[PDB]
Write a protein that binds this DNA or RNA. Structure first.
Length: 73
RNA sequence: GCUGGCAAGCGAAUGUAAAGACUGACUAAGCAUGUAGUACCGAGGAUGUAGGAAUUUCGGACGCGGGUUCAACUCCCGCCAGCUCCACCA
């Protein structure tokens, strides 16, 4: 369910909705399986309607053995 | 506007205020063509056919690139990231 145990133990969630996000082929096809690292995503104000911040990309072996796919994307 | 013919005082009754045509040097004050102005807008008028607001969506991304069914998000190919099989003795 990806409950975000940090945000569960601290400052219980109050409001949420449902929406997707935009990403490239590198950082995709693993979220379909479920692996990810979304613990305490630091989403801050962005001019483009608060672009997703904080959470990185899953460390699954989809790497081109240079980087995972994108250290910062 | 000073004057202009005089009644009215020099501080009195108290003023009509049009301003266009016509000659020409025209390239306004050498020098191209003139008798009303083609300029300049900015709150004076209009475009609203198309680009800006909503509104149907085209655009995108499942690795990329493109010649492919467009319904592509693997319908045809070259690579690269792993598995396997061997070729591979100057």
């Amino acid at each position: 369910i990806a409950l975000n145990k940090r945000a569960r133990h601290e400052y219980f969630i109050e409001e949420e909705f449902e929406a997707g996000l935009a990403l490239q082929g590198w950082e995709v096809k693993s979220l379909r399986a479920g692996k990810a690292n979304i613990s305490d995503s630091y989403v801050l104000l962005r001019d483009g309607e608060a672009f997703l911040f904080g959470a990185n990309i899953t460390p699954m072996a989809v790497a081109s053995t240079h980087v995972v796919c994108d250290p910062t994307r």
